[PDB]
Design a protein around this ligand. Sequence first.
Ligand SMILES: [Zn+2]
Ligand SMILES: [Zn+2]
Ligand SMILES: [Zn+2]
Length: 572
Amino acid sequence: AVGACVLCNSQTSLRCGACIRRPFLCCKCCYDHVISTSHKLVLSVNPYVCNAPGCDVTDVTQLYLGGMSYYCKSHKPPISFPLCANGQVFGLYKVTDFNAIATCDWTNAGDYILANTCTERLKLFAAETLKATEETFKLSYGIATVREVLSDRELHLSWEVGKPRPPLNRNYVFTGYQIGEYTFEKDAVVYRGTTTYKLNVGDYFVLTSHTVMPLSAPTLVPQEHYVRITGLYPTLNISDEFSSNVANYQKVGMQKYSTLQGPPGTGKSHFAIGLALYYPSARIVYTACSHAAVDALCEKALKYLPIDKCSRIIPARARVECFDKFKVNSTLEQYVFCTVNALPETTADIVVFDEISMATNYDLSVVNARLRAKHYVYIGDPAQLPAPRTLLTKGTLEPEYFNSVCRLMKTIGPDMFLGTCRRCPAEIVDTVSALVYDNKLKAHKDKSAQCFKMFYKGVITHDVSSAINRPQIGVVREFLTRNPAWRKAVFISPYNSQNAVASKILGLPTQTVDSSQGSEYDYVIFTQTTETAHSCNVNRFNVAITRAKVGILCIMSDRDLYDKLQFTSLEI
Ligand SMILES: [Zn+2]
Ligand SMILES: [Zn+2]
Ligand SMILES: [Zn+2]
């Protein structure tokens, strides 16, 4: 009931009853809010509503202070004061950007632009409002119910009518009923339940709708620059293997927080684990939003750090199988590997937050609120993929607006940049260097002469909204017959339905561009499928072609990206 104004910090009893998150607004800011938005309900110790029996006047601009109570113009006594007047709303302790965040529906890109350009307190207000909006929207979808048990991995389903049916993709992890988190993918559909339980006919599932907690900590702590390495103890016996990062590790210890832009295969995980060998007594918490990003840090640590000082934090609700080689759930070990949403309340000498393009301002804040560290390291690449914004349907979200860390990397530049790609053949490195890295990314490898491109629009079919291009898969089939070494390639496309079709026709392992991020393969076969904003997205295209260590075949739909690929063209 008592607190500080989100816009000016002036103390108040006044909150907005029309905002989904009921923020405290001072007498001045509350007035500026109510008089320019449809938000007219104001909440003090008691709500600002007409106290006359049966009266439904709740608009603050139509209410007055009559004695110790509130009344409308129709019910107030002769000695009464308007609650709204003189640029202030009556309350104890006596804007444009706040209004827009408070009233938007989060379906436009401009909403996320504003949520990243505003003041720090407005960033938390926006992040809390957005996440609560996202969670409420999850209730709009309808409940599902098991129609039959086709086999151990397949089935056919039934829905409750009247409410919209969400898409069948590995993008919507539903929680099961308490029978583990289930997922779906394409009348013969596939039930993907992480927990091996015979799906009882009649049971139901609901979207993973977790309650949104308030944010208190900023997305980024205030920057502090030091003249000496603070609270960390370096070595001069630093392995030659990590010597290239020595100046950057010293930079880490001389600032409160630091940003590292690491293009694909430039050594992000090597840098993160090497930071532990450079400050060998430091307690490091390694965090990322996904279990995949956390497990990739676990694999690198397994090679350089002592296994007895590592612990993989796994929440009681075992969602998917993750890293099995560290002692599970020991918060006090020197090296703790844990996803953002599962972080314990602890302190650290260094916090390493990896895959920063996938973080939201909500995640940035959670880390600041759960971990109190001497140093914070943000590793990622704003030229890679951001977290999916399920409400966003209009406009494209540019990298400078992914989150606060990405905004800094795009506006003032990152503090550290890993300039040499060690993974990809030079054809790929040269293409992405010009496309998203302003020619600052260099190739370690020579050209492989196994990077091919083909311009083939094919035929686009749609599975509801997800796209398929059977002729592009047919072209891959013909290529495989003449290129048997490509037998072990991973098939990548921007669409789950295209991948399901390629999996049956080609028999190759499949991956969407979004799920390939952070992974690498000798050979990659990419079919663009369509020429939509989704399939032409430069960050997605960058991720797609940088998965390859040796060769890549790109079957393209977009002339622009096809011309930019510095690959040998194929005919047919
Ligand atoms: Zn104020
Ligand atoms: Zn409001
Ligand atoms: Zn009244």
